[PDB]
Amino acid sequence: SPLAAYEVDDSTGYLTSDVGGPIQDQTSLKAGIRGPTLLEDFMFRQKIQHFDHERVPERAVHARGAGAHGTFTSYADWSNITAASFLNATGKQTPVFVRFSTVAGSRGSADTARDVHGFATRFYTDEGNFDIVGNNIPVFFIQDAIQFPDLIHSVKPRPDNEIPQAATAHDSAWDFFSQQPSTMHTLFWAMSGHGIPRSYRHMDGFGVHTFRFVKDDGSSKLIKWHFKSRQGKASLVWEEAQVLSGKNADFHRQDLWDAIESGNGPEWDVCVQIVDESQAQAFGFDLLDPTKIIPEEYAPLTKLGLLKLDRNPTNYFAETEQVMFQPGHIVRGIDFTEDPLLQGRLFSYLDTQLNRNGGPNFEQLPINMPRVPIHNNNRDGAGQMFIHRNKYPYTPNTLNSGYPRQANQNAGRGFFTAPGRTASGALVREVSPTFNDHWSQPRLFFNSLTPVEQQFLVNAMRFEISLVKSEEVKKNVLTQLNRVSHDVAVRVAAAIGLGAPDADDTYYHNNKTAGWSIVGSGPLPTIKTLRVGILATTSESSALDQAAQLRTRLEKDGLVVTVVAETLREGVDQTYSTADATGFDGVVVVDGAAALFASTASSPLFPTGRPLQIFVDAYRWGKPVGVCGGKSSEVLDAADVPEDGDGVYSEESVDMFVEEFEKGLATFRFTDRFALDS
Amino acid sequence: SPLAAYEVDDSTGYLTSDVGGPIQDQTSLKAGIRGPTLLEDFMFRQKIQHFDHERVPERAVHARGAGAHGTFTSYADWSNITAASFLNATGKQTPVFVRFSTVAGSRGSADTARDVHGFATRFYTDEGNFDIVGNNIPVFFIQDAIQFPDLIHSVKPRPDNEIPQAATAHDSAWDFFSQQPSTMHTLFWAMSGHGIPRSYRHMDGFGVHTFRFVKDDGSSKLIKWHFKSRQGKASLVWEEAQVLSGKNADFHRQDLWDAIESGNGPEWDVCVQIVDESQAQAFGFDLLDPTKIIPEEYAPLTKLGLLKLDRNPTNYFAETEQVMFQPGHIVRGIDFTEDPLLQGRLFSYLDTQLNRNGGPNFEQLPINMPRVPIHNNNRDGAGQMFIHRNKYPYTPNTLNSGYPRQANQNAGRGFFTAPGRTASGALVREVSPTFNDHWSQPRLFFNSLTPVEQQFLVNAMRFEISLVKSEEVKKNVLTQLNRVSHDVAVRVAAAIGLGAPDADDTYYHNNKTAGWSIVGSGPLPTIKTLRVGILATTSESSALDQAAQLRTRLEKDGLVVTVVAETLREGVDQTYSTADATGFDGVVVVDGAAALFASTASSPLFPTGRPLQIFVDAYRWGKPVGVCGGKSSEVLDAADVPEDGDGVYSEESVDMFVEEFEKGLATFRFTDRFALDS
Ligand code: HDD
Ligand code: HDD
Ligand SMILES: [Ca+2]
Ligand SMILES: [Ca+2]
Ligand SMILES: [Ca+2]
Ligand SMILES: [Ca+2]
């Protein structure tokens, strides 16, 4: 472990206090065997005091998340574009820590809520910690950081009763969206499959803001960060996400942990779009505007290196809960832009750690420490762990010989502000007119989805907006949607029994761009780690033998196989009672188990109809399903599943079955099973 | 009320800072229209600082919960048994605040996790705040407060990856239960329907510990607090609880809020069992042991008064999140016992508020303030909101004329320790042998459940233990369960493919007691607030007219009616897309909607088979279901629901249908639909 120096081992030895005195901790000291507990019981108090103070404030946003360690490897010497030391040589390795998250939910809320997702990466570089604090969606709801509490109050639970948890499906959120049109772009992304990703591994990371790369000669270029998943992009469907939020609140964190433990640690290409300073307004919008994306057709990705997560934490609290990211953790070679959303973030992340940590020495927590020496005149504060030998911590000094020395552009590899940056004009609390088109890019995004994806997005909006109580807010929502697409407004209006306003075509267009569509990103590049549930029975020795044979053939290709039956025994992982279609990417029934597949099928060991429900749920949610053994028409008829269907498999031969089935797992979702408007 | 003085109205006026200076908060101050943000923007920083510091540590246990205001009314002058002032006169009214909760989950976890539930009541009495910090289960897992971190660490998520949220279904919890046999009694309760109550209103409250009632003459008796629900006892079924955890994490808090808003604020009889000091060991166990209950057959309930919750909070955070309960909040007329669990609690709750509040003046928060004058020498501390006039805050003094005066048994209505209490013997960290029978009362509890309830408990254990990975832990669990009941151990063993150990009859017996069974507690005494979903369609005017007719007749009797159709319009509350059987206590399909229940039924407006699934789920989960308004075998046949079944209703006549259906809502659950072992 990168944090091995801090680890404490308790695999041997006797219980001690925190000051090393051996003690016991199982019975209170009392005045007699049936007597009251004594104040002088220090063993009791030290233990309970610690317990009583275990909690810390959850993060103000992105409270629900999980993390892992890894390594970043540069693909080249990037000195041609940046002074950044972690990018300065082919093959240069830097340790990382990544945390993924939702936004709105509190720390025990479900992973599979519909939400924007955090993707926060720390690079522990040889010139200091560098953090890229990104999301899985490339654009943000608002154009100025000062609005962040308004956005967050609106999407978080209503503050009288704190309902609803981890959801935008309430009046306040849609009130805000409808009144603040900047929100439309991120809203469309959140309402697409990007709002309910299959896993953290199957989503991308984006810095969102324009940043600068600064060379050692002082020249700069404008960049956007894109972390492109090597596992491919995949989404849940909403009805699946909802059940999964109940069956397994921990789904995304379990998925990540398991992938790492099995040697399938996720990878991303760390990429940038790079453009000249002179192109700040060349693409038909302002690069300072965090509601806008540069189409890849206008500015291609450069792959900088590989991010791989391959080690799980030892202690969640100490590593994942305490990691304290900051966009202020910047290194020489990177600089900010005048994005008013970014500008205000720089304040927030330094301040909020005082809340979380309760003290100013939060950079001394192991997970937060850098991997190079610290030389500065910061001193004291609660929880101060260092013992500083320099007794003249001021500049300028002679009594410590002028140390520490100042670092800048020309000495000490100092950070420096890009020297071509300037400001001009009045000191204003005014929005740039260049930010005023809130609707064209939401339309570009909608236009770039496939027909079934467009339907899923409409369906997400119909779901959420149908739960808004205020008729005025609903009308206001359709007004805003209508500015993006008349068709969207019509289709959503139909579900909520309002009429859509007349078409307003000011921002309508038919342009499209590549790389935003989930459904359109073709088969997954790997099916390693995908989950196959094999539904079997203990009532037939032949069913368990078919299940074992399938297990062997599927595990050979790196699939995670679960054999399901009525009761556990050797070879059976899970009972029907605990099994659900949300647990699998594909479902196979062995044809020795066909008798379980009545909807009438009843047992004290699982809920009525459970075996068939798992198969039917899997089919309805677009998953590859099949029967293995040659006799398929009893199972398929019970389930109302057509044998001829795409992503439906039946074969006697285990080998032929698995070859077909694995193409289905790569396809991932069979979208022909979903009805479309008109 | 301290609350009314601190209410803040923002229905009019201009935005101000916290110091009353009018400001704006929508655009950052910048150096030029596309410039960097300025450090001198105090509007920005005060708003973001506040946002950055909004969160406080969640409670270490019972983090997920909800609260309401109410009133307690004494039924009599109880001077004959206690000096407590809030019980000293017929009709005497005291304001209350109650918070209900789960135990293990974090703040945004689901209400319908399987868990023990908190029921914490504050009485703002005219002699000081009195808190009864209870649970919905009358016994606790452990016999000594020093063990509480062990219990809690074992049941909370595994600390390497923080999985799983809000669940005992993991190895560590079952390891603890199997190694610490005291846990068996509470474990049986949590594995019964008491682990998944239908609502906070449909559960009881217990103080758990033996306390003392102390008279003004100094004499004392031993008491147990029982708050008996006037709404009746009701439970979910597990599969329903699981879906509901995903469809509506806020189910119990929504239920409570809605009942209060509709004028159906929940009620409890506040009761005690009262016995003599000489009976500490008369009932076959030790009244100091918090794993034991006194059977009502040995000690009947005395009703002391009425608890009614009837007002929702104004601000969740300020009231519900900040309320800081303590068993240390005791009043004259009540005393502690030497219950080692209770003894240690007294320390914990005073200490933990320093964590939550971040400072020592947490009793000054409006929700924590008393309703009588405070006279003491407590001074200073962070957040000090008082300006004390008394400049000689020490006793004894002459310079403040000897005020405040000391209060005790003889003067000033002081609190006093029951004067009959003694201690004798060695100072020991030893458990009383009188605590050693961990298995008889778990068996009494199991024996007192009906056959279908015994099956649900066995099924909950089969579910959880099947998810334990360690075969050794599973074996250890069976060893412990076997000491309670060989039959339980055999039936649980069958689901996990182990053999149960041989019968060990040391603690086996056939005794039963009344008042623990949910299923056996007869029909609900009221059906007000129960939810009826009416499944209809917009494609038939007749379906909406049947729905309206049913609505009228059901709303008349105080039922909360939801009409479901494809799309919203006048008369329709919810779409099929957002509807689920977990939203209803009963489900009615109107005859005119029969076309939606065909297997070929598909729509872009809801998932395939949604209408039928709602009906079938409702039936499977034991709910009253029916079809109203023709000769209506088409819907019952599609659902495979037998017309002759108990809790299945089929009538042409709206009036006849409703009369029958409402008896079904009172019966609540039709337990005949659940399979039993053999
Ligand atoms: C002005 C305030 C503000 C604004 C405009 C933003 N955020 Fe932020 N963000 C915070 C204030 C903040 C915060 C309150 O400071 C958090 C809470 C915890 C923390 O360390 O910082 C936070 C946490 C946080 C985390 C969790 C880091 C972790 O896992 O611990 C992520 C991934 C993001 N944010 C991402 C974004 C992105 C991609 C944004 C826009 C492009 C963004 N935030 C705008
Ligand atoms: C030695 C520690 C300890 C032990 C043995 C107990 N608890 Fe406790 N309990 C706490 C330590 C604690 C705590 C850490 O101090 C909490 C967390 C937040 C707070 O105010 O106190 C708490 C909170 C808490 C709450 C939530 C109050 C609220 O809604 O804010 C309830 C209802 C209970 N407990 C009830 C019980 C019952 C019925 C117990 C056994 C009879 C029990 N606790 C044993
Ligand atoms: Ca709202
Ligand atoms: Ca999708
Ligand atoms: Ca565990
Ligand atoms: Ca005394």
mmCIF file of N, CA, C and O in Angstrom, chain A residues 28 30 32 34 37 47 52-55 60 107 144 146 150 153 159 162 165 239 250 253 286 316 343 348 351-352 426 428-430 495 568 600, chain B residues 28 30 32 34 37 41 47 52-55 60 107 144 150 153 159 162 165 250 253 286 316 343 351-352 355 426 428 430 495 568 610 640:
data_model
loop_
_atom_site.group_PDB
_atom_site.id
_atom_site.type_symbol
_atom_site.label_atom_id
_atom_site.label_comp_id
_atom_site.label_asym_id
_atom_site.label_seq_id
_atom_site.Cartn_x
_atom_site.Cartn_y
_atom_site.Cartn_z
ATOM 1 N N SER A 28 -18.330 -3.622 32.509
ATOM 2 C CA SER A 28 -18.207 -2.373 33.280
ATOM 3 C C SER A 28 -17.773 -2.673 34.711
ATOM 4 O O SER A 28 -18.078 -3.757 35.299
ATOM 5 N N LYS A 30 -18.271 -2.071 38.517
ATOM 6 C CA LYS A 30 -19.438 -1.802 39.268
ATOM 7 C C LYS A 30 -19.174 -1.975 40.761
ATOM 8 O O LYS A 30 -18.270 -2.697 41.165
ATOM 9 N N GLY A 32 -20.248 -3.788 43.338
ATOM 10 C CA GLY A 32 -20.932 -5.021 43.544
ATOM 11 C C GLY A 32 -21.475 -5.630 42.253
ATOM 12 O O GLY A 32 -21.646 -4.935 41.238
ATOM 13 N N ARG A 34 -24.348 -6.744 41.284
ATOM 14 C CA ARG A 34 -25.614 -6.122 40.744
ATOM 15 C C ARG A 34 -25.630 -4.597 40.993
ATOM 16 O O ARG A 34 -26.727 -4.006 41.129
ATOM 17 N N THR A 37 -22.563 1.367 37.869
ATOM 18 C CA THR A 37 -21.312 1.554 37.216
ATOM 19 C C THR A 37 -20.538 2.743 37.833
ATOM 20 O O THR A 37 -21.107 3.740 38.169
ATOM 21 N N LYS A 47 -13.489 3.982 25.646
ATOM 22 C CA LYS A 47 -14.120 3.207 24.573
ATOM 23 C C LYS A 47 -15.392 3.901 24.067
ATOM 24 O O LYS A 47 -15.561 4.072 22.840
ATOM 25 N N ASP A 52 -18.777 7.424 20.566
ATOM 26 C CA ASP A 52 -19.666 8.595 20.543
ATOM 27 C C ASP A 52 -19.205 9.683 19.577
ATOM 28 O O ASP A 52 -20.036 10.469 19.152
ATOM 29 N N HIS A 53 -17.908 9.719 19.261
ATOM 30 C CA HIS A 53 -17.318 10.694 18.364
ATOM 31 C C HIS A 53 -16.806 10.091 17.056
ATOM 32 O O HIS A 53 -16.008 10.733 16.349
ATOM 33 N N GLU A 54 -17.319 8.919 16.644
ATOM 34 C CA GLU A 54 -16.837 8.312 15.430
ATOM 35 C C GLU A 54 -17.237 9.087 14.189
ATOM 36 O O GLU A 54 -16.509 9.060 13.194
ATOM 37 N N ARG A 55 -18.398 9.724 14.206
ATOM 38 C CA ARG A 55 -18.919 10.353 12.980
ATOM 39 C C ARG A 55 -18.329 11.734 12.731
ATOM 40 O O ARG A 55 -17.990 12.456 13.628
ATOM 41 N N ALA A 60 -20.867 17.994 1.765
ATOM 42 C CA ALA A 60 -22.059 18.804 1.492
ATOM 43 C C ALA A 60 -22.790 18.368 0.208
ATOM 44 O O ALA A 60 -24.045 18.463 0.104
ATOM 45 N N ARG A 107 -25.132 10.015 2.833
ATOM 46 C CA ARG A 107 -24.065 8.996 2.692
ATOM 47 C C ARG A 107 -24.528 7.514 2.678
ATOM 48 O O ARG A 107 -23.612 6.552 2.338
ATOM 49 N N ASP A 144 -22.474 30.116 -12.682
ATOM 50 C CA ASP A 144 -21.745 30.923 -11.654
ATOM 51 C C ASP A 144 -21.802 30.169 -10.327
ATOM 52 O O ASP A 144 -22.852 29.718 -9.923
ATOM 53 N N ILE A 146 -21.715 31.127 -7.392
ATOM 54 C CA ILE A 146 -22.525 31.727 -6.293
ATOM 55 C C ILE A 146 -23.929 31.116 -6.277
ATOM 56 O O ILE A 146 -24.614 31.177 -5.244
ATOM 57 N N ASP A 150 -28.237 27.478 -4.376
ATOM 58 C CA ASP A 150 -29.583 27.494 -4.887
ATOM 59 C C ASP A 150 -29.878 26.178 -5.624
ATOM 60 O O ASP A 150 -30.909 25.537 -5.335
ATOM 61 N N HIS A 153 -29.910 23.300 -2.875
ATOM 62 C CA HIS A 153 -31.101 23.347 -1.979
ATOM 63 C C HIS A 153 -32.323 22.816 -2.758
ATOM 64 O O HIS A 153 -33.171 22.135 -2.196
ATOM 65 N N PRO A 159 -36.956 21.114 2.805
ATOM 66 C CA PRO A 159 -36.340 21.240 4.123
ATOM 67 C C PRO A 159 -37.284 21.245 5.318
ATOM 68 O O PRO A 159 -36.801 21.221 6.434
ATOM 69 N N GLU A 162 -37.640 16.882 4.878
ATOM 70 C CA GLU A 162 -36.496 16.220 4.272
ATOM 71 C C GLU A 162 -36.975 15.007 3.415
ATOM 72 O O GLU A 162 -36.521 13.868 3.583
ATOM 73 N N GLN A 165 -35.406 11.777 -0.672
ATOM 74 C CA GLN A 165 -33.990 11.389 -0.716
ATOM 75 C C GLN A 165 -33.530 11.110 -2.148
ATOM 76 O O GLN A 165 -34.181 10.346 -2.923
ATOM 77 N N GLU A 239 -36.432 1.279 -14.546
ATOM 78 C CA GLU A 239 -37.206 0.362 -13.669
ATOM 79 C C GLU A 239 -36.245 -0.586 -12.954
ATOM 80 O O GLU A 239 -36.461 -0.868 -11.782
ATOM 81 N N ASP A 250 -25.645 -0.785 -2.400
ATOM 82 C CA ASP A 250 -24.214 -0.770 -2.520
ATOM 83 C C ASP A 250 -23.728 -1.237 -3.897
ATOM 84 O O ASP A 250 -22.561 -1.518 -4.038
ATOM 85 N N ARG A 253 -20.517 0.488 -5.551
ATOM 86 C CA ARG A 253 -19.297 0.286 -4.732
ATOM 87 C C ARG A 253 -18.901 -1.183 -4.697
ATOM 88 O O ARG A 253 -17.721 -1.506 -4.741
ATOM 89 N N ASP A 286 -18.865 30.287 -25.667
ATOM 90 C CA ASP A 286 -17.724 30.783 -24.910
ATOM 91 C C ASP A 286 -17.111 29.621 -24.129
ATOM 92 O O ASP A 286 -17.817 28.968 -23.366
ATOM 93 N N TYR A 316 -12.108 2.036 5.008
ATOM 94 C CA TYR A 316 -12.937 2.956 4.234
ATOM 95 C C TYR A 316 -12.911 4.375 4.864
ATOM 96 O O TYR A 316 -12.748 5.382 4.115
ATOM 97 N N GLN A 343 -14.056 29.442 -10.719
ATOM 98 C CA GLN A 343 -13.440 30.477 -9.867
ATOM 99 C C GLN A 343 -13.908 30.314 -8.410
ATOM 100 O O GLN A 343 -13.150 30.366 -7.503
ATOM 101 N N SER A 348 -14.413 27.135 -2.169
ATOM 102 C CA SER A 348 -15.306 26.212 -1.469
ATOM 103 C C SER A 348 -14.554 25.017 -0.897
ATOM 104 O O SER A 348 -14.779 24.628 0.247
ATOM 105 N N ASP A 351 -12.311 25.734 2.188
ATOM 106 C CA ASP A 351 -13.149 26.055 3.332
ATOM 107 C C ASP A 351 -13.875 24.809 3.901
ATOM 108 O O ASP A 351 -13.900 24.612 5.143
ATOM 109 N N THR A 352 -14.484 23.980 3.025
ATOM 110 C CA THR A 352 -15.353 22.945 3.496
ATOM 111 C C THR A 352 -14.599 21.882 4.297
ATOM 112 O O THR A 352 -15.193 21.225 5.185
ATOM 113 N N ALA A 426 -14.831 47.230 -15.983
ATOM 114 C CA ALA A 426 -15.456 47.557 -14.721
ATOM 115 C C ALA A 426 -15.473 46.319 -13.816
ATOM 116 O O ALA A 426 -15.427 45.148 -14.295
ATOM 117 N N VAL A 428 -17.726 44.147 -11.994
ATOM 118 C CA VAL A 428 -19.165 43.968 -12.280
ATOM 119 C C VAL A 428 -19.662 42.663 -11.667
ATOM 120 O O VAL A 428 -18.932 41.665 -11.617
ATOM 121 N N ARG A 429 -20.936 42.681 -11.255
ATOM 122 C CA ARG A 429 -21.708 41.477 -10.947
ATOM 123 C C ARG A 429 -22.700 41.269 -12.102
ATOM 124 O O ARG A 429 -23.912 41.437 -11.918
ATOM 125 N N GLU A 430 -22.173 41.036 -13.316
ATOM 126 C CA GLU A 430 -22.981 40.949 -14.546
ATOM 127 C C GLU A 430 -22.566 39.666 -15.271
ATOM 128 O O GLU A 430 -21.386 39.264 -15.236
ATOM 129 N N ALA A 495 -48.024 12.912 -20.964
ATOM 130 C CA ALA A 495 -48.065 12.062 -19.764
ATOM 131 C C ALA A 495 -48.665 12.798 -18.568
ATOM 132 O O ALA A 495 -49.129 12.159 -17.623
ATOM 133 N N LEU A 568 -28.945 -23.635 -0.668
ATOM 134 C CA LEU A 568 -27.513 -23.691 -0.916
ATOM 135 C C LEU A 568 -27.046 -25.143 -0.739
ATOM 136 O O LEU A 568 -27.574 -25.895 0.071
ATOM 137 N N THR A 600 -47.203 -19.732 -10.907
ATOM 138 C CA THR A 600 -47.842 -20.403 -9.767
ATOM 139 C C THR A 600 -46.805 -21.037 -8.795
ATOM 140 O O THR A 600 -47.192 -21.486 -7.704
ATOM 141 N N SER B 28 -21.309 36.579 -9.249
ATOM 142 C CA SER B 28 -20.043 36.886 -8.609
ATOM 143 C C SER B 28 -19.509 38.241 -9.108
ATOM 144 O O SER B 28 -19.766 38.669 -10.236
ATOM 145 N N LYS B 30 -16.575 40.416 -10.496
ATOM 146 C CA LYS B 30 -15.475 40.025 -11.352
ATOM 147 C C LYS B 30 -14.745 41.255 -11.874
ATOM 148 O O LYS B 30 -15.343 42.332 -12.045
ATOM 149 N N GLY B 32 -13.930 42.687 -14.823
ATOM 150 C CA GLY B 32 -14.394 42.637 -16.199
ATOM 151 C C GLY B 32 -15.433 41.529 -16.425
ATOM 152 O O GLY B 32 -15.527 40.574 -15.631
ATOM 153 N N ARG B 34 -15.868 39.085 -18.493
ATOM 154 C CA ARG B 34 -15.315 37.736 -18.627
ATOM 155 C C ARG B 34 -14.063 37.546 -17.757
ATOM 156 O O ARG B 34 -13.132 36.834 -18.123
ATOM 157 N N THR B 37 -12.955 36.125 -10.543
ATOM 158 C CA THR B 37 -13.710 36.519 -9.404
ATOM 159 C C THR B 37 -12.816 37.189 -8.336
ATOM 160 O O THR B 37 -11.667 36.765 -8.120
ATOM 161 N N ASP B 41 -15.355 39.924 -2.826
ATOM 162 C CA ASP B 41 -16.819 39.576 -2.938
ATOM 163 C C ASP B 41 -17.268 38.868 -1.647
ATOM 164 O O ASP B 41 -17.271 37.635 -1.574
ATOM 165 N N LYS B 47 -22.122 33.432 1.585
ATOM 166 C CA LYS B 47 -23.143 32.439 1.101
ATOM 167 C C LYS B 47 -22.504 31.048 0.960
ATOM 168 O O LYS B 47 -23.071 30.073 1.446
ATOM 169 N N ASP B 52 -20.937 25.524 2.642
ATOM 170 C CA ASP B 52 -19.809 24.626 2.888
ATOM 171 C C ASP B 52 -19.840 23.965 4.267
ATOM 172 O O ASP B 52 -19.258 22.896 4.430
ATOM 173 N N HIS B 53 -20.511 24.620 5.235
ATOM 174 C CA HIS B 53 -20.576 24.188 6.586
ATOM 175 C C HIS B 53 -21.991 23.779 7.020
ATOM 176 O O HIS B 53 -22.246 23.682 8.257
ATOM 177 N N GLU B 54 -22.875 23.456 6.067
ATOM 178 C CA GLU B 54 -24.224 23.112 6.429
ATOM 179 C C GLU B 54 -24.327 21.805 7.195
ATOM 180 O O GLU B 54 -25.233 21.655 8.002
ATOM 181 N N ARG B 55 -23.467 20.834 6.913
ATOM 182 C CA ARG B 55 -23.632 19.485 7.449
ATOM 183 C C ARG B 55 -23.038 19.381 8.851
ATOM 184 O O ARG B 55 -22.050 20.024 9.176
ATOM 185 N N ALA B 60 -24.556 8.662 15.792
ATOM 186 C CA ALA B 60 -23.673 7.451 15.656
ATOM 187 C C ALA B 60 -24.518 6.195 15.439
ATOM 188 O O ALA B 60 -24.025 5.227 14.841
ATOM 189 N N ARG B 107 -27.780 8.468 7.292
ATOM 190 C CA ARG B 107 -28.875 9.452 7.201
ATOM 191 C C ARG B 107 -29.837 9.332 6.007
ATOM 192 O O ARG B 107 -31.063 9.958 6.098
ATOM 193 N N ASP B 144 -24.560 -5.120 28.693
ATOM 194 C CA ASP B 144 -23.618 -4.158 29.325
ATOM 195 C C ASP B 144 -23.286 -3.102 28.274
ATOM 196 O O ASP B 144 -22.978 -3.440 27.165
ATOM 197 N N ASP B 150 -19.095 -2.824 20.114
ATOM 198 C CA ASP B 150 -18.902 -4.111 19.518
ATOM 199 C C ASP B 150 -20.148 -4.461 18.701
ATOM 200 O O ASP B 150 -20.070 -4.832 17.523
ATOM 201 N N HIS B 153 -20.407 -1.935 15.638
ATOM 202 C CA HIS B 153 -19.381 -2.200 14.624
ATOM 203 C C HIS B 153 -19.753 -3.449 13.801
ATOM 204 O O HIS B 153 -19.594 -3.468 12.571
ATOM 205 N N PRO B 159 -15.779 -2.473 7.555
ATOM 206 C CA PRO B 159 -15.063 -1.206 7.519
ATOM 207 C C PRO B 159 -13.965 -1.057 6.473
ATOM 208 O O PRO B 159 -13.406 0.034 6.378
ATOM 209 N N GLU B 162 -17.172 -0.462 3.458
ATOM 210 C CA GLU B 162 -18.436 0.076 3.910
ATOM 211 C C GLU B 162 -19.625 -0.542 3.122
ATOM 212 O O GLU B 162 -20.479 0.170 2.547
ATOM 213 N N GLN B 165 -24.985 -1.458 3.444
ATOM 214 C CA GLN B 165 -25.777 -0.394 4.066
ATOM 215 C C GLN B 165 -27.043 -0.984 4.750
ATOM 216 O O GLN B 165 -27.825 -1.737 4.151
ATOM 217 N N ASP B 250 -38.304 7.155 1.689
ATOM 218 C CA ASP B 250 -38.916 8.055 2.630
ATOM 219 C C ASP B 250 -40.283 7.560 3.126
ATOM 220 O O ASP B 250 -41.029 8.325 3.697
ATOM 221 N N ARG B 253 -41.303 8.255 6.951
ATOM 222 C CA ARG B 253 -41.375 9.686 7.243
ATOM 223 C C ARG B 253 -42.530 10.337 6.450
ATOM 224 O O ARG B 253 -43.216 11.222 6.984
ATOM 225 N N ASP B 286 -33.850 -11.496 36.130
ATOM 226 C CA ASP B 286 -33.427 -10.352 36.879
ATOM 227 C C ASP B 286 -33.959 -9.114 36.192
ATOM 228 O O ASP B 286 -33.689 -8.926 35.015
ATOM 229 N N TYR B 316 -36.824 20.818 9.185
ATOM 230 C CA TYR B 316 -36.339 19.497 9.561
ATOM 231 C C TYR B 316 -34.985 19.592 10.303
ATOM 232 O O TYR B 316 -34.780 18.961 11.370
ATOM 233 N N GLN B 343 -26.967 2.152 32.791
ATOM 234 C CA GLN B 343 -25.939 2.885 33.538
ATOM 235 C C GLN B 343 -24.948 3.555 32.585
ATOM 236 O O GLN B 343 -24.641 4.746 32.724
ATOM 237 N N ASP B 351 -22.088 13.049 26.260
ATOM 238 C CA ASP B 351 -20.839 13.146 25.486
ATOM 239 C C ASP B 351 -21.091 13.315 23.979
ATOM 240 O O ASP B 351 -20.456 14.181 23.355
ATOM 241 N N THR B 352 -21.993 12.515 23.398
ATOM 242 C CA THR B 352 -22.106 12.458 21.945
ATOM 243 C C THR B 352 -22.607 13.781 21.376
ATOM 244 O O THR B 352 -22.291 14.136 20.233
ATOM 245 N N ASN B 355 -20.049 16.018 19.877
ATOM 246 C CA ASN B 355 -19.719 15.623 18.510
ATOM 247 C C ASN B 355 -20.692 16.307 17.548
ATOM 248 O O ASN B 355 -20.272 16.957 16.549
ATOM 249 N N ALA B 426 -17.669 -6.310 46.282
ATOM 250 C CA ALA B 426 -16.407 -5.997 45.742
ATOM 251 C C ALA B 426 -16.637 -5.072 44.560
ATOM 252 O O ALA B 426 -17.737 -5.092 43.994
ATOM 253 N N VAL B 428 -16.156 -4.857 40.993
ATOM 254 C CA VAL B 428 -15.933 -5.964 40.054
ATOM 255 C C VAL B 428 -16.273 -5.547 38.623
ATOM 256 O O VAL B 428 -17.188 -4.764 38.388
ATOM 257 N N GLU B 430 -17.487 -8.045 36.568
ATOM 258 C CA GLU B 430 -18.013 -9.412 36.508
ATOM 259 C C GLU B 430 -19.509 -9.297 36.190
ATOM 260 O O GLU B 430 -20.196 -8.368 36.697
ATOM 261 N N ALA B 495 -32.124 -24.328 4.362
ATOM 262 C CA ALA B 495 -31.942 -23.333 3.278
ATOM 263 C C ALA B 495 -30.472 -23.100 2.929
ATOM 264 O O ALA B 495 -30.162 -22.603 1.841
ATOM 265 N N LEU B 568 -51.844 11.519 -16.660
ATOM 266 C CA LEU B 568 -52.556 12.350 -15.711
ATOM 267 C C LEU B 568 -53.640 13.134 -16.461
ATOM 268 O O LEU B 568 -53.480 13.484 -17.632
ATOM 269 N N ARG B 610 -46.833 -3.492 -16.497
ATOM 270 C CA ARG B 610 -46.853 -2.758 -15.211
ATOM 271 C C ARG B 610 -48.230 -2.874 -14.524
ATOM 272 O O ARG B 610 -48.312 -3.139 -13.321
ATOM 273 N N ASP B 640 -54.062 -14.806 -12.283
ATOM 274 C CA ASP B 640 -54.082 -16.090 -11.620
ATOM 275 C C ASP B 640 -54.493 -15.926 -10.157
ATOM 276 O O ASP B 640 -53.952 -16.559 -9.320
#
